[PDB]
PDB file of C-alpha atoms in Angstrom:
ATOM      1  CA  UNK F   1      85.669  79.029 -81.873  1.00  0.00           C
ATOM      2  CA  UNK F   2      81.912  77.891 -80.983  1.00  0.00           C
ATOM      3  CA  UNK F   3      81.195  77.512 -84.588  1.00  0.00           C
ATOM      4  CA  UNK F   4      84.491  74.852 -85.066  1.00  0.00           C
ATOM      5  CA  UNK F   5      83.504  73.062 -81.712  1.00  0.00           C
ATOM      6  CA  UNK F   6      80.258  72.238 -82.839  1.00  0.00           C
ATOM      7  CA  UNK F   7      81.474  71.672 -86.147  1.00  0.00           C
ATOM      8  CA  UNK F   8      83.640  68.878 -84.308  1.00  0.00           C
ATOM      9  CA  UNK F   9      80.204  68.009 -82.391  1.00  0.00           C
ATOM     10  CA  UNK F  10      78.685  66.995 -85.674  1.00  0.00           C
ATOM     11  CA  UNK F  11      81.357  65.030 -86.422  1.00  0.00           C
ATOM     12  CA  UNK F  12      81.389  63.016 -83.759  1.00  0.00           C
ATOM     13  CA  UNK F  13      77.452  62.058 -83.650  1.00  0.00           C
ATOM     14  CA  UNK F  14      77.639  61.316 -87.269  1.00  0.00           C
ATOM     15  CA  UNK F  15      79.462  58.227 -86.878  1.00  0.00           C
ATOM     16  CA  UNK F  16      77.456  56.737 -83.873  1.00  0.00           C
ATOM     17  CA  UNK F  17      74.093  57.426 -85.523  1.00  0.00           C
ATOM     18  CA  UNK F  18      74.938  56.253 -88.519  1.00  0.00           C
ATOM     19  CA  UNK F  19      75.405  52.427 -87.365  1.00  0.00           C
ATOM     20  CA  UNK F  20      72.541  52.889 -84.305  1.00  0.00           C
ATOM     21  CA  UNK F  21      69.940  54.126 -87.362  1.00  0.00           C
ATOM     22  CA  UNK F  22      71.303  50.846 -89.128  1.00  0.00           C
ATOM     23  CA  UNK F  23      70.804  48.465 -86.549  1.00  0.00           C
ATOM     24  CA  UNK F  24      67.391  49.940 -85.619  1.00  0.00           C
ATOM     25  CA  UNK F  25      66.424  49.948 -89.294  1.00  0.00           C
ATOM     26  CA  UNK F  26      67.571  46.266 -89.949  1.00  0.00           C
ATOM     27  CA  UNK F  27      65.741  45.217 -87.029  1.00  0.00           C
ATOM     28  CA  UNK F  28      62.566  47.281 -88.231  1.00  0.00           C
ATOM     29  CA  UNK F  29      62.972  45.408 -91.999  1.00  0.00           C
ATOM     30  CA  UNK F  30      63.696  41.686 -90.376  1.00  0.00           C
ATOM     31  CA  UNK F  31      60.208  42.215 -88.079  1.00  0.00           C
ATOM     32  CA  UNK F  32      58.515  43.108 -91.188  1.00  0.00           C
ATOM     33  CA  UNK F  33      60.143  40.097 -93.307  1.00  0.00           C
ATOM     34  CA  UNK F  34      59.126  37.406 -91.109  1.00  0.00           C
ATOM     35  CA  UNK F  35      56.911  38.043 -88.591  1.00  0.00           C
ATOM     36  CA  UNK F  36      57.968  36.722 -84.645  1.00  0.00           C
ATOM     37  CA  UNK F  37      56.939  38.199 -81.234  1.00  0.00           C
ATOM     38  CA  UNK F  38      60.977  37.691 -80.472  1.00  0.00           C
ATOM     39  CA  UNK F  39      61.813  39.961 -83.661  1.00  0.00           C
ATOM     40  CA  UNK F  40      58.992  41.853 -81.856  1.00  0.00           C
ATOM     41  CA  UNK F  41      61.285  42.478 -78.490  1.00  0.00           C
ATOM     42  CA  UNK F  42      64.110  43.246 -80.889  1.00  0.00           C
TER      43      UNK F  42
END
């Protein structure tokens, strides 16, 4: 019962963190591309 719950848990934070990590990670690779104070505050 607890086990399947957090199973479903999981599940759902899978999703969200996937595309957060992305955006965060883009964000990291376009401030080390160019190189802006505004890419800086992203």
């Amino acid at each position: 019962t607890i086990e399947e719950q957090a199973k479903t848990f999981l599940d759902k934070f899978n999703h969200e963190a996937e595309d957060l990590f992305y955006q965060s990670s883009l964000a990291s690779w376009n401030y080390n591309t160019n190189i802006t104070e505004e890419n800086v505050q992203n």
